[PDB]
Scaffold this active site. Structure first.
Site, short mmCIF file in Angstrom:
data_model
loop_
_atom_site.label_atom_id
_atom_site.label_comp_id
_atom_site.label_asym_id
_atom_site.label_seq_id
_atom_site.Cartn_x
_atom_site.Cartn_y
_atom_site.Cartn_z
N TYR A 29 86.75 26.24 31.09
CA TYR A 29 87.89 25.19 30.48
C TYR A 29 88.95 25.97 30.26
O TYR A 29 89.09 26.96 29.39
CB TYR A 29 87.55 24.45 28.71
CG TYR A 29 85.92 23.53 29.65
CD1 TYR A 29 86.26 22.16 30.19
CD2 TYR A 29 84.77 23.61 29.18
CE1 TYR A 29 85.27 21.72 30.49
CE2 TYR A 29 83.77 22.87 29.90
CZ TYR A 29 83.70 21.90 30.84
OH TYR A 29 83.02 21.17 30.94
N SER A 30 90.35 25.36 30.67
CA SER A 30 91.14 26.19 30.24
C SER A 30 91.95 25.67 29.28
O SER A 30 91.70 25.35 28.55
CB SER A 30 92.66 25.50 31.54
OG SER A 30 92.11 25.42 33.07
N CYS A 76 98.10 23.77 38.16
CA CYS A 76 96.58 23.41 37.26
C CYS A 76 96.71 21.93 37.08
O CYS A 76 96.68 21.02 37.15
CB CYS A 76 97.05 24.15 35.52
SG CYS A 76 95.14 24.37 35.15
N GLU A 86 95.56 27.14 39.69
CA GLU A 86 94.60 26.99 39.85
C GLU A 86 93.76 25.44 39.84
O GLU A 86 94.34 24.54 38.42
CB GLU A 86 94.20 27.85 38.14
CG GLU A 86 92.47 27.48 37.60
CD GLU A 86 92.95 28.42 36.03
OE1 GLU A 86 92.31 29.51 35.54
OE2 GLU A 86 92.85 27.38 35.22
N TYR A 131 90.35 22.29 40.95
CA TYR A 131 89.27 22.13 40.24
C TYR A 131 88.82 20.85 40.35
O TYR A 131 89.57 19.88 41.03
CB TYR A 131 88.93 23.15 39.14
CG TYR A 131 89.82 22.57 37.58
CD1 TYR A 131 89.66 21.14 36.86
CD2 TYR A 131 90.97 23.37 37.64
CE1 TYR A 131 89.59 20.77 35.96
CE2 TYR A 131 91.28 22.64 36.37
CZ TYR A 131 91.14 20.88 35.68
OH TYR A 131 91.95 20.35 34.73
#
Ligand SMILES: Cc1cc2nc3c(=O)[nH]c(=O)nc-3n(C[C@H](O)[C@H](O)[C@H](O)COP(=O)(O)OP(=O)(O)OC[C@H]3O[C@@H](n4cnc5c(N)ncnc54)[C@H](O)[C@@H]3O)c2cc1C
Ligand code: FES
Lengths: 92, 296
Positions: B77-78, B254, B294, B296
């Site tokens: 988790y960012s 992101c 990044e 996902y």
């Protein structure tokens, strides 16, 4: 991507082709040239050289101040070539 | 030579084989009750033993075992908080977690394992944490940078991190004086994340910060097109494209993968206008740390 760096040592004068993202010392090492080095971390004098022409990216080294950088001092362990460069080595 | 932060960055002080055990300090739903899906903001204690940096992730290892009796695989988790953290004492880490619940082709309701464990945490609970993880989304060295932040849903997290450090904090070695330009795309207003904080940031740095929301289900342009992140971007199309020609512009992206394509297509036709192939220009921007993804 690759620059010619001429290395003027107290034993004469060598030519290296240094990739723009390999540290000068590191190439030097790869091609058999023995340059002095100690910390290898850009915060002592040990690998001090001097740029005679051309330009380096010294990637936020810690040891040299602006004055000195302006004078052409290079830390050969922490310097990337940004052009074709001639450096005087062995310079404490 | 990286154009991104490197001094003072550490990774992998902890690994899945031996996580750090922290404590849930708080855990708060930040979306409205009518959102499509809950997002929660939560803060864990770290005793300062996890000195992460803006941009990085941590892994969580959820309690219990999978269907085969193996412990659960790390999920990343960012980090939603800045290095000094929501409490500003350097002993906490915060996440921005979307609860994953979906119906599959068979008609069954499936709960995503780590997202529901996280989103279920009570204050006092133990969390198994690993990291820090990642170098890819670190901030530019340049304090006068143009940082363009392209986020969807929980992809706001590392950017919440950046922007806290840039605008809510005083640091001797870092005074941001560039332009921070945040785009955040969600499907509804009730899905919006940290709006108030960004509001505060716009108020105190009107010259250094911009934020543009794209709410695909509630906003159109006058051509009738829904406002996904790329369609909001289209409106600043040439301004952005100019900015991209610069030494000191860094784009960060992101969130959900598949946000990527819509953006590429905006860029593709920007590029062709110039004779340029976008993908050549892109991979070349990556080589200069200027297009950091990044998803996902
Ligand atoms: C670098 C990085 C940073 C991340 N940051 C964040 C973050 O800030 N916040 C955040 O919420 N998450 C983030 N994630 C995603 C996160 O790591 C988890 O993958 C996510 O929370 C789902 O995990 P889970 O264990 O709950 O689901 P799981 O139990 O792992 O189940 C997921 C599986 O179910 C299926 N599935 C997954 N999603 C769907 C869907 N929408 N519809 C149908 N089927 C599906 C897929 O096969 C998928 O493999 C990040 C991931 C990465 C790699
Ligand atoms: S060896 Fe100490 S700076 Fe290069």
């Amino acid at each position: 991507a690759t620059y010619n760096v001429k290395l003027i040592t107290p034993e004469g004068e060598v030519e290296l082709q240094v990739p723009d993202d390999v540290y000068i010392l590191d190439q030097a090492e790869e091609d058999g040239i023995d340059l002095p080095y100690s910390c290898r971390a850009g915060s002592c004098s040990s690998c001090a050289g001097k740029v005679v022409s051309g330009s380096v990216d010294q990637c936020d080294q810690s040891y040299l101040d602006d004055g000195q950088i302006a004078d052409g001092w290079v830390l050969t362990c922490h310097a990337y070539p940004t052009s074709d460069v001639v450096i005087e080595t062995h310079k404490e | 030579c990286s154009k991104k932060q490197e001094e003072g960055v550490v990774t992998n002080l902890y690994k899945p084989k031996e996580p750090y055990v922290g404590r849930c300090l708080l855990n708060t739903k930040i979306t409205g009750d009518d959102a499509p899906g809950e997002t929660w903001h939560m803060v864990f204690s770290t005793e300062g033993k996890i000195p992460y940096r803006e941009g990085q992730s941590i892994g969580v290892i959820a309690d219990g075992v999978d269907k085969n009796g193996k412990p659960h695989k790390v999920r990343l988790y960012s980090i939603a908080s800045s290095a000094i953290g929501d409490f500003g004492d350097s002993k906490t880490v915060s996440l921005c977690v979307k609860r994953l619940i979906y119906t599959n082709d068979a008609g069954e309701i499936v709960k995503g394992v780590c997202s529901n464990f996280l989103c279920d945490l009570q204050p006092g609970d133990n969390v198994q944490i690993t990291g820090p993880v990642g170098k890819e989304m670190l901030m530019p060295k340049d304090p006068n940078a143009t940082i363009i932040m392209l986020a969807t849903g929980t992809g706001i997290a590392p950017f919440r991190s950046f922007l806290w450090k840039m605008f809510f904090e005083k640091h001797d070695d870092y005074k941001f004086n560039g332009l921070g330009w945040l785009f955040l795309g969600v499907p509804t207003s009730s899905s919006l994340l940290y709006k108030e904080e960004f509001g505060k940031m716009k108020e105190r740095a009107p010259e250094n910060f911009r934020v543009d929301y794209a709410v695909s289900r509630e906003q159109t342009n006058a051509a009738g097109e829904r406002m996904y992140i790329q369609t909001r971007m289209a409106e600043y199309k040439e301004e952005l494209w100019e900015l991209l020609k610069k030494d000191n512009t860094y784009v960060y992206m992101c969130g959900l993968k598949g946000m990527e394509k819509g953006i590429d297509d905006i860029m593709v036709s920007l590029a062709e206008k110039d004779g340029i192939d976008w993908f050549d220009y892109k991979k070349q921007l990556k080589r200069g740390d200027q297009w950091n993804v990044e998803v996902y």
